[PDB]
Amino acid sequence: LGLSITGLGVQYPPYSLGPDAIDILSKRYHPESPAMKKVLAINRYTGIDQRSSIGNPDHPLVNKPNPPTVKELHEVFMSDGVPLAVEASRKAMAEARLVPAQITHMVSTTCTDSANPGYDHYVAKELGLSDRLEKVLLHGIGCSGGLAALRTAANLCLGHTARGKPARILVLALEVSTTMVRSELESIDALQETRIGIALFSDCASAVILSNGIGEAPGKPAIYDLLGWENRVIPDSEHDLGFDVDPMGWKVVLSPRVPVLAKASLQPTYADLLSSLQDQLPSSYQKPADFDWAMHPGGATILSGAESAMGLTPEHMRASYDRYINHGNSSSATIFSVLNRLREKDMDALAPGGKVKEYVVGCAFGPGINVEMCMLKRR
Amino acid sequence: LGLSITGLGVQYPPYSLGPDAIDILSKRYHPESPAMKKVLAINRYTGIDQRSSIGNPDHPLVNKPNPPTVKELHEVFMSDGVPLAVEASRKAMAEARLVPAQITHMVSTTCTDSANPGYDHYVAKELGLSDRLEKVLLHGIGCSGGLAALRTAANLCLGHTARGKPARILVLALEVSTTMVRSELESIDALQETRIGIALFSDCASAVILSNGIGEAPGKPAIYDLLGWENRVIPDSEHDLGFDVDPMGWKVVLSPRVPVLAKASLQPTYADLLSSLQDQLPSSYQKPADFDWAMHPGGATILSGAESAMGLTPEHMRASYDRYINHGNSSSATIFSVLNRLREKDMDALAPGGKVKEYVVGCAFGPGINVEMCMLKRR
């Protein structure tokens, strides 16, 4: 296919929210209640030590008399989120050794903003990208956005391949979720329902460059080759996972079914992915445990579910754990963060049986429920 | 390129509102003010006879104590907008003689909803499309969305072409703008700004099927062949045109500069479009007046501006006039409505000098400011 990830860049904001962040904010704005106590308890065994954030608990946006409106959220997405996306993109392009003029397409995602022009316009402008740049800003997909953006970029790359044209696509994910803490606290308190969103979600921007190989800097270096992909929707699961627009931003929808639905999907999706390329893979790469797994860490049970269903050790998803524990779930931006971390020396040291794998399965789930899987060859 | 539009479908909602509709609602909810008087005056200067709407001025959504919240808007987008999208998509598929399992990708757009899962999911589900359908829900682009979706679909089609695979892409636009009347009225009253959006915008869904011709039998009919496209961003014009998220939905941004900037972009964009494919065109298709023009009728000044800039008659854009006068500006959904109407017999009857043109220039502008053009060959 001639598709390769030639650069990756990741930019977390400077700040880290410990588990007491929600304790502080909850006590500041709400009375003690049974539902809040439950959430505060769950918060303590998510497996997350620190959640990356654009601010600390005293940030002015989350310390108003009321939760910030979706307009006030947008202002901070633009002031504090967009610079992360710009830096992540710069880092990706620098590793890919590309200048702004070489970028042919941009595929961007977020579920934590709505705007016209979209945030991708402002990132592209700051980077000095072409006024003829072809842009796609994806919506509606939440956590799966990273791999969906990548797959979309793959298709777009091949569209240029068809015409014999070089394609270098900036694939970008930016999420700012921590600013919706007051919204979630209000819902917990008012509805007396256990809403665990505030215990999981964090802020990040991440980016990769996907090249179609045409007119490449020959002998062309890459970090990963993109060999294949599978995408699927689980029927009658709309109500199980969601993010509903609201005057206070977006409200998390999350049912008890999600862990089982996610886990049960791995086997058939994996089988479908491998059948579409079994003659391309060596016999040393046949069963799940043969691969390194770049899983989107939606929650602790997603990782433990993958371990159980696919016969993997935690070290098979070492980069997923590393991002999850130290930064939390950054929705669509997490997966490129995982892929970036996986190829680092300190992750190599933790490979199952001291065996760093040449092939990597990427996996993510989001609202739909949408399932995304990709197959990468690590250089 | 082997790209052809093999079906088109359009579905306007049940109601058609004269200029008195906003008079009724304005008077019901606001005392007369200088800004309101100006908007109600401008409402009659547009040349729009009727605007298509999901409701009449007695609709409950626009008759609450306050304007509907963005959540309340979403509920009606789903109840009253999605069915339009389903029907438009059905008719496009029917004309293309395609059954659900044959659709390989979906490229959808809207600027009048935010949701996870996105609205495209629900449309696709109602249509019975594949659980492996590749979807793209565009955001951030407003009025240029129809042509942006078409161009994105073209690139995606060619991605499948690169792999020797059939591509049949449902390209869909749905906009429900009329429900934001109360939000606009509130801003007019409170800010005393002359906000003309409520004089212009209407509701519609429209769809096309774009095929890459692979797996189609020889001599397969099509309505238009897609030959080429141009996209540009007009520099330093973000503040001139936009749609900003708000607890009340989205607030229109519209400067007096827009018609001037738009008019100025036509000649240079057209020249680039034409030069890229001039060798493919006969001698009788060399100058602007040689073509039929499917313009997105963003406002009356856009049409008269195009006539001036490119030396055209109104009959050159007869389908654009027809849509604008009888239905208003349905944002991203209008352009496919124009292309559908253009190929109808009573439009053939208004062709400049009795010559129905074999080649059609498509053009649309939206937030960015983004300019989109395409060249179609009419079968």
Instruction: Give me the amino acid identity at A133.
Output: L
Q: Write down which residue in B203, B222, B241 finishes a domain.
A: B222
Residue B90: which residues within 8 A CB-CB, separation 6 or more? B9, B127
Candidate from B152, B368, B370 with C-beta closest to A136: B152
In this structure, the answer to whether residues B113 and B171 fall within a common structural domain is yes
Specify the DSSP element, H or E, that contains B190.
helix B181-191
Buried/exposed code over B202-222 (b: 16+ C-beta within 10 A; e: otherwise): bbbbbbbbbbbbeebeeeeeb
Nearest-CA distance from B59 to chain A in Å?
21
Residue A235 shares a structural domain with residue A212: no
**Euclidean distance between CA atoms A154 and B308, whole angstroms:** 42
- Helix (H) or strand (E) holding A134, with range, is strand A134-138
**How many separate domains does chain A show?**
2
Determine contact: B121 vs chain A, CB below 8 A.
yes
User: Helix, strand or coil for residue B372?
Assistant: strand
Of B201, B222, B243, the residue that ends a domain is B222
Under 8 Å between Cβ of B356 and B320: no
Same domain, B212 and B273: no
Comparing CB atoms, the residue among A157, A235, A247 nearest residue B69 is A247
- Residue A34, helix vs strand vs coil: helix
φ/ψ of residue A368, rounded to 5: 155, -70
Q: In chain A, which residue ranges form alpha helices assigned H by DSSP?
A: 20-29, 34-42, 70-76, 82-95, 119-127, 145-162, 181-191, 197-200, 258-275, 300-310, 318-327, 334-342, 345-348
Residues 6+ apart with CB under 8 A from B361: B270, B273, B288, B291, B292, B293, B294, B373, B374, B375, B376
Secondary structure class of A13 (helix, strand, coil):
coil
Cα separation, A156 vs A30, in Å, equals: 48
Same domain for A161 and A242:
no
Measure the CA–CA gap between B119 and B81, rounded to whole angstroms: 9
State CA B366 to chain mean position distance: 10
Distance from CA of B9 to the nearest CA of A (A): 24
Q: Mind telling me how many Å the CA of B247 is from chain A's nearest CA? A: 4
Best of B109, B131, B155, B175 to substitute, by most chain A Cβ atoms within 10 angstroms, is B155
Nearest to A162 among B140, B158, B235 (CB): B158
CB contact burial A17-35 (16+ within 10 A = b; e otherwise): bebebbeebbeebbeeeeb
B154 and B96 in a common domain: yes
Q: Does B141 touch chain A (CB under 8 A)?
A: yes
Task: Provide the 8-state DSSP code for A369.
Answer: T
**Which residue in chain B has the smallest CA separation from A111?**
B116
> Could you tell me where the DSSP H helices lie in A128-257?
145-162, 181-191, 197-200
Give the span between the Cα atoms of B186 and B181, in whole angstroms: 9
Q: What is the DSSP letter of A77?
A: I
User: Per the CB < 8 Å rule, is B233 touching A368?
Assistant: no
Q: How far is B276 from chain A (nearest CA, A)?
A: 13
Q: With an 8 Å Cβ cutoff, are A116 and B116 in contact? A: no
Chain-chain contact of A131 with B244 (C-beta, under 8 angstroms) = no
B98 burial class (0-12, 13-18, 19+ CB within 10 angstroms)? middle
Strand partners, B105: B134, B169
A277 and A169 part of one domain:
no
**Residue B206, strand partner residues:** B10, B173
Cα A48 to Cα B135: distance, rounded to the nearest angstrom: 32
Q: CB of A371 within 8 Å of any CB in chain B?
A: no
Instruction: Please report the number of interchain residue pairs, chain A to chain B, with beta-carbon separation below 8 angstroms.
Output: 178
- Test A368 with B136 for CB contact under 8 angstroms: no
Greatest Cα pair distance in chain B: 65
Answer whether B137 sits within 8 Å of A139, measured CB to CB.
yes
**Binding-face residues of B in 222-251 toward A, CB within 8 A:** 230-233, 235, 238, 242-248, 250
- How many CA atoms within 13 Å lie on the side-chain side of A371? 24
Which residue in B207, B191, B186 sits closest to B124, CA to CA? Answer: B207
Q: Does A166 touch chain B (CB under 8 A)?
A: no
Pair (B140, B256) in one structural domain: no
Give A142's contacts in chain B (Cβ within 8 Å).
116
Q: From A77, which residue of chain B is nearest by alpha-carbon distance?
A: B245
Task: Give the CATH number for residue A181.
Answer: 3.40.47.10
What is the rounded CA–CA span in Å between residue A112 and residue A178? 10
Using CB atoms, pick whichever of A132, A154, A367 lies closest to residue B116: A367
Is the minimum CB–CB distance between B116 and chain A shorter than 8 Å? yes
Domain of A277 in residue numbering reads as 223-379
Chain B: nearest CA to A6, how far in angstroms? Answer: 20
Q: Which of A166, A195, A222 is the last residue of a domain?
A: A222
**Closest Cα to residue A209, out of A243, A239, A168?**
A168
PDB resolution in Å: 1.8
B241 and B210 part of one domain: no
Do the bridges between strand B224-233 and strand B370-378 make them parallel or antiparallel, or are there none, so unpaired? antiparallel
According to DSSP, the residues that pair with A371 across neighbouring strands are A232, A365
Determine the residue of chain A that is closest to B133 in CA distance.
A232
Pairwise CB contact (< 8 Å): A69 & B247: yes
Coil/strand/helix, residue A11: strand
Q: Which two tokens stand for residue B206?
A: 């429209």
State whether A153 and A250 are in the same domain.
Answer: no
Q: Are residues A48 and A166 in the same domain?
A: yes
CA neighbor of A361 nearest in space, from A171, A262, A227, A265: A227
Structure tokens at A130: 């072409």
Whether A143 is catalytic is yes
How many Å apart are CA B152 and CA B132, to the nearest integer? 19
Two tokens, residue B51: 């605007």
Q: From A129, which residue of chain B is nearest by alpha-carbon distance?
A: B233
Let me know: does B271 contact B309? Beta carbons within 8 Å: no
Q: Are B373 and B361 in contact (CB under 8 A)?
A: yes
Q: Which residues fall within 8 angstroms of residue B65, CB to CB, at 6 or more apart?
A: none
Q: Exposed, middle or buried by CB within 10 Å (0-12, 13-18, 19+), for A363?
A: buried
Non-local (6+) Cβ contacts of A70 within 8 A are A114, A245, A246, A247, A248, A249, B70, B245, B246, B247
Q: Do B71 and A246 make contact, defined as CB atoms within 8 angstroms?
A: yes
> What's the token pair of residue B326?
């009888």
- Annotated catalytic residue: which of B143, B204, B363, B374? B143
Confirm or reject contact between A68 and chain B (CB < 8 A).
no
Q: What is the DSSP string of B51-70?
A: EEESS-TT-GGGSSSSPPPH
List the structure tokens of B197: 């959006």
Q: Tell me what percent of chain A is helix, strand and coil, each rounded to the nearest 5.
A: 45, 20, 35
List Cα–Cα distances, B150 to A204, B57, B210, in angstroms.
31, 34, 8
What is the DSSP code string of B259-314?
Answer: HHHHHHHHHHHHHHHHHHHGGGS-TTS-SGGGSEEEE--SSHHHHHHHHHHHT--G
Omega into B352 within 30° of 0, i.e. cis? no
Q: In DSSP terms, which residues pair with A4 in a beta bridge?
A: A211, A225
Residues with Cβ within 8 Å of residue B69, at least 6 apart in sequence: A246, A247, B247, B248, B249
Site from B76, B105, B116, B236 to mutate, A interface, most A CB atoms within 10 angstroms: B116
Q: Which residues of B touch A238 (CB under 8 A)?
A: 117, 121-122
Q: Are residues B258 and B360 in the same domain?
A: yes
User: Of the candidates A111, A117, A158, which has its C-beta nearest B162's C-beta?
Assistant: A158
Same domain, B75 and B177: yes
A333: closest CA among A242, A224, A204? A204
List chain A residues with CB under 8 Å of B370. 117
> Is residue B340 a contact partner of residue B349, using CB atoms and an 8 Å limit?
no
